[PDB]
């Protein structure tokens, strides 16, 4: 993976473009991804 | 003049209380706010 710049991500089925930063929100260690509001996949956890 | 001057003071503080202390009174405010927020988020939510 990348860091810090648009990329277009399939991840593992959850395929978007963004960039991918360091994320300070701390997940559950069965929990895989992410979202806040209407499905926004905010954020996700690398499965490797 | 002074009873009037007084009665002035006493009221402007009065406002300052009432709006202070009783809230919903910027209600025509916070539901013209609400009702876009929520009508942008159920924009949002048809993308689902």
């Known amino acids: 993976l990348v860091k810090n710049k648009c990329v277009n991500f399939n991840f593992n089925g959850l395929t978007g473009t963004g960039v ?5 929100k701390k997940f559950l260690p ?3 991804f992410g979202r806040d509001i209407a499905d926004t996949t905010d954020a996700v ?3 490797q | 003049q002074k ?3 007084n009665q002035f003071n006493s ?6 209380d009432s709006l202070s202390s009783t809230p919903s009174a910027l209600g025509k405010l916070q539901d013209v706010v609400n009702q ?3 009508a942008l988020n159920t924009l949002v939510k048809q993308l689902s």
């Open chain 2, 36 to 38: 876009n927020a929520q």
């Open chain 2, 11 to 16: 009221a402007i503080g009065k406002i300052q």
């Open chain 2, 3 to 5: 009873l009037i001057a």
């Open chain 1, 45 to 47: 956890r690398d499965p």
């Open chain 1, 20 to 24: 991918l930063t360091e994320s300070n």
């Open chain 1, 30 to 32: 069965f929990q895989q």
